[PDB]
Design a protein around this ligand. Structure first.
Ligand SMILES: O/N=C/c1cccc[n+]1CCCCCCC[n+]1ccccc1/C=N/O
Ligand SMILES: O/N=C/c1cccc[n+]1CCCCCCC[n+]1ccccc1/C=N/O
Lengths: 535, 533
């Protein structure tokens, strides 16, 4: 080895790694980036569960992010930061089963609570290498060991011919699980405490985190979970075995393809091809629906997440869950007619009713009418600003907020310690229009402490706010309690309970406790709407 | 023989009585017959005009209350008693009362015709709360009120039959209205300015006159307090009236002619004994014999008629009370009583909803329950009780009022809406019922002006406000004082703004949206949910 920095040389089960000393505002961090945790899921291994990475010889260079899993690249607004920031920042490859570790520099003397990030991207995109997921700040400032993994998204991660051997489904979850296993086995080499592993993830990452809560083999792999603006339950996070079967076969047809023959044919298809066609398998014109998502395979998910959260026992579990003020807004611009990032997206009543069909694609006419009935401000049913916002709300509520309420409820009710938040601070640097409020994904950069980077132009209040949030998150990672055990002058973040339904606002202001997470409306989505589908 | 108390009406001479109202005399002409007593073969039959009489008809005491069920739920309780018959029950009850100022107006003064409520099963124009002396005295109103047949006698219909064609209680009303047209001038009342007002079934009745062409020429303005021709209780279909009439007949031991003929042979209390027993479900705020959509008096359902009606030159004042629904809960909704605080369980709430929305399928009932649960405190009994109140008032009054308000406004009516939020200090019902329906009536009628009644002085001032609104409305079609300013003004209810005022001790506050969200649920969604089960 010779002349390299002794702190960047770590051994893991698969061999030797050279990480990189990264600058964070407050000092250096060790980053080990692109550590393989799986055999490349290429060729015959596409759609297949991940196989653990075979040891390598010599010192693996872990100084750069590895490939991003093959995925649809958003080109709605080319060159626009608001979309770009989420797009692959590394080469797209199916050989993308890599993970990243950030640790204090020098690496912590004593075992440090590990935060594992699981990115979102609706299960068709994402990458642990995105700037918003930069673990350097949590590592430097909070002394956290932060792990993020790439997991296969899209067909590659989720195309399922349920029952088959060649495409069992949920393999992207299995990638994730494999990275969790990797952390259990290897994190101590970094000063990470495998006995204090907190999964956190946003959106599909949050759904993913929830699936891990819901899937035994994952349960031993982490101790606490943060679910940001996503849940395993809800209308998008999973598909039935039947529907996954439907979509896999359809995608097969779309690309020119007994499961084995079909999958074999899919495995001959070049990655871009699967990507090019994956959008085209969705049953309706929808937003917040993704083609290849966790399949309720009876295996990874032994039953629907709804069933599993309704009957699961979560004694041991501390969960931090929450939402942004405007979960729906982001989605509207991706094909709800009338919505745009470039204008105030004031919509008509017709455009609202139309958006409701798209936003609640599984809704019957009655259901959709209920939604419209429920979200219409009957004092100004025609008011386009209201309609625009209720459209946001419908989509936000239906996909995130109410799933999260449902999740926080069922979890609390079944033993888990649940801390619920709503994140309400619109980043000063947001490039999405004002009307979009705090769209989802836009708390991430705060949790991750990007605002601490002076070069990023965040306000001072945001830097402080990020520090608070990192404190909450890492306090939660350390203890199962977001609350600063030191400073008790600060207002307390009370558990969320079915009885009290307490959750906190996360904004520039001190923690304000609020009760009932959109309680009225979520009763509509979580209790009433299902029944409206039983008839 | 006070000459002020002598009136020649079309059917002959009447002697009223001089009554004292706190600020002066009023001429009261009480018990004027406007119809042949609808007795014997005339039971269930359209009222015939009262034949002329000889000499001087003593119109100094209230006449008989139409034969009706007397409420025995809380015997001796002012809260229930004040609605009970305060005169002999008789089928011979087709009498109206006229209060005028004393001396009687020099010039044609606007007429208020009060139509009492009582679910179409009860009421009397003679109840102390319908005392017309105040409005007569303070406001120079010629106040008219009629008895109309309630229960089987007014509303037992075998639709299409010649001898129980239904809506006769309404025809009774229509006849009193015609009587006013023909006769009110003789009292100094202005037949060209007749404002119908009524509360609850009386409001529904006013509503029905609005919706019935023959009635339209008999009044110019309408005030529907806490009731509407539309909504779940004010009407039944022909088939349902037929069903209940034939069921009632079965229950009393009885081809239309023969069935009706048999029913006609039955003592009045026998019909009333079995009146209750014909409701299709265990309900509250549902009444056995109510106006029937007959394609005659009501050419279509009130729903249909308010949707399509043309109301250009109509002024309507509608409103509700804060707690439209509370009163009704004690009458069959388990867990509710005027005595305890009626803190109900969730279970009792769910059960109460099937009773309160008796027409609700399971799903619809769940929708109601889901809607009215405060999911933040889903089992809190105060909330559930209040929600049960709300469920009932909304389903039954507030939302039908909102629907009517909106449909009338849209269809060109001039509409003023109110919510009445002042609980009478003298209210014998418990606090949790807040302002139950009916309990604005005493205020509108001016009862707090009678110092003997123990209303606070604020209530007297308020009743004076209320009487001004009602009579201004009577006078002008606009409840606003063309004397006052910045008061604020009571704005018309419109479908756009949805402005309505709070009638309470505090000055008018304009509000927007008469339970708009919840009424959208009741008026827009519930129907879809039922018309798809
Ligand atoms: O695989 N799908 C390809 C495709 C093709 C044609 C049109 C649409 N799609 C889906 C992309 C949906 C975009 C949904 C939102 C994208 N997004 C990315 C990162 C962070 C946030 C978001 C949006 N949140 O609302
Ligand atoms: O027609 N027979 C009816 C009957 C017979 C035997 C037992 C019970 N009932 C119904 C009771 C009245 C319905 C409740 C309305 C009571 N009420 C009367 C006057 C003024 C107001 C009210 C209550 N409003 O909520």
């Amino acid at each position: 080895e010779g002349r390299e920095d002794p702190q960047l040389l770590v051994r893991v089960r698969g061999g030797q790694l050279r990480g990189i000393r990264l600058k964070a505002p407050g000092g250096p961090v060790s980053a080990f980036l692109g550590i393989p945790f799986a055999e490349p899921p290429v060729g015959s291994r596409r759609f297949m569960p991940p196989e653990p990475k075979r040891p390598w010889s010599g010192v693996l260079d872990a100084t750069t992010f590895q490939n991003v899993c093959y995925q649809y690249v958003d080109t709605l607004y080319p060159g626009f930061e608001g979309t770009e920031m989420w797009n692959p920042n590394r080469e797209l490859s199916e050989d993308c089963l890599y993970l990243n570790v950030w640790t204090p520099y020098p690496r912590p003397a004593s075992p440090t609570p590990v935060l594992i990030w699981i990115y979102g991207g609706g299960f068709y995109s994402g990458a642990a290498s995105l700037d918003v997921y930069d673990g350097r700040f949590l590592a430097q400032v909070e002394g956290a060991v932060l792990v993020s993994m790439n997991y296969r998204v899209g067909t590659f991660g989720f195309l399922a011919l349920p029952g088959s051997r060649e495409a069992p489904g949920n393999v992207g979850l299995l990638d994730q699980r494999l990275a969790l296993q990797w952390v259990q086995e290897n994190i101590a080499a970094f000063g990470g405490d495998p006995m204090s592993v907190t999964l956190f993830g946003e959106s599909a990452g949050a759904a993913s985190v929830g699936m891990h809560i819901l899937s035994l083999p994952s349960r031993s792999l982490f101790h606490r979970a943060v679910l940001q603006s996503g849940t395993p339950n809800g209308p998008w996070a999973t598909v039935s075995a039947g529907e996954a079967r439907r979509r896999a076969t359809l995608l097969a047809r779309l690309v020119g393809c007994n499961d084995t023959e079909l999958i074999a044919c899919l495995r001959t298809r070049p990655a871009q091809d699967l990507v090019d066609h994956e959008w085209h398998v969705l049953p309706q014109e929808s937003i917040f629906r993704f083609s290849f998502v966790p399949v309720v395979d009876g295996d990874f998910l032994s039953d629907t997440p709804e069933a599993l959260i309704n009957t699961g026992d979560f004694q041991d579990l501390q969960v931090l869950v929450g939402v942004v003020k405007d979960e729906g807004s982001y989605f509207l611009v991706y094909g709800v007619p009338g919505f745009s990032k470039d204008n105030e997206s004031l919509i008509s009543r017709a455009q609202f009713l139309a958006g409701v069909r798209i936003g609640v694609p599984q809704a019957s006419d009655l259901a959709a009418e209920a939604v419209v009935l429920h979200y219409t401000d009957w004092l100004h049913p025609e008011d386009p600003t209201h309609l625009r916002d209720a459209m946001s709300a419908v989509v936000g509520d239906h996909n995130v907020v109410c799933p999260v309420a449902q999740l926080a409820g069922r979890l609390a009710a079944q033993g888990a310690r649940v801390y619920a938040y709503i994140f309400e601070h619109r980043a000063s640097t947001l490039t999405w229009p004002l009307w979009m409020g705090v769209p989802h994904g836009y708390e991430i950069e705060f949790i991750f402490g990007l605002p601490l980077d002076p070069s990023l132009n965040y306000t001072t209040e945001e830097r402080i706010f990020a520090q608070r949030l990192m404190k909450y998150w890492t306090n939660f990672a350390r203890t199962g309690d977001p609350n600063d055990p030191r400073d008790s002058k600060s207002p307390q973040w009370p558990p969320y309970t079915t009885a009290a339904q307490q959750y906190v606002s996360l904004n520039l202001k001190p923690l304000e406790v609020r009760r009932g997470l959109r309680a009225q409306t979520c009763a509509f989505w979580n209790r009433f709407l299902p029944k409206l589908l039983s008839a």
